[PDB]
């Protein structure tokens, strides 16, 4: 049970460091940690200014295909499209393979559904031109309400999200199995399972946690569905828990 789930989950990790005071040394160490005795993580996720040093570290350890994700409009999810789009354009220029943008969830909570569509769509158009995948963080722990989680997910998908993602990791409540079920049901109901991935992020701590999230995916979409284009774990400490479950 835990061995099989843990080796799947490890391969799906966006191994992340997003601190206010990160350093090159910490990002280098993270890149080294992404190359494990049982597999490489799918990606690393770091702030944009670290993309060049991460790319060279990944090449120099012989893992050039570990993707580099970053974040924009982050963590706030403010509703200023010009800023979100400028930050997304800058992340592309820094060399990102993927951008995880924060949806304007407080504007949605205040009744504005259109700004979330326009913000995601603008960011998607910049990313798509550069062959960069766009994940959209809806911040389920602050939306709280099931109807709002569904609505933010639907808007994001309609606007072109390549993934929908639970959380920034910067608020009090991040991924939960409840939130994951709701978001994956939207992917199912909208018929976009082929084109939209899911990423639970923040507070995914243990191999046991990861096994729960994969069980939801397998139930909704079949055991074949999850893969790097369709599923990621936004996590850090989880990696050591997965390796421990695997005997490392």
Residue numbers in the entry: 3 to 250
Give excerpts from the publication.
2-Deoxy-d-ribose-5-phosphate aldolase (DERA) is used in organic synthesis for the enantioselective reaction between acetaldehyde and a broad range of other aldehydes as acceptor molecules. In 2001 the catalytic mechanism was resolved for DERA from Escherichia coli (DERAEC) by Heine et al.: the active K167 forms a Schiff base with the donor molecule, while K201 functions to reduce the pKa of K167 and, together with D102, participates in a proton-relay system critical for efficient catalysis. However, practical application of DERA in organic synthesis is limited by its poor stability towards high acetaldehyde concentrations. Hence, a monomeric variant of the enzyme (K58E-Y96W) was used that has virtually identical biochemical properties.
To determine the structure of these reaction product(s) and to identify the exact target site(s) within the protein, X-ray structures of DERA from E. coli before and after acetaldehyde incubation as well as after thermal treatment have been determined. Crystals were obtained for all three states under the same conditions, yielding datasets with resolutions ranging from 1.1 Å (native enzyme) to 1.5 Å (after heating). All three structures turned out to be very similar, with obvious alterations limited to the catalytic center. Interestingly, the native enzyme features electron density for a six-atom molecule with about 70% occupancy, which is attached to the active lysine residue. Given that this type of linkage is expected from the well-established catalytic mechanism of DERA, our findings may be rationalized by the presence of trace amounts of aldehydes in bacterial lysates or crystallization solutions. Importantly, this appears to be a reaction intermediate reflecting the intrinsic aldolase activity of the protein.
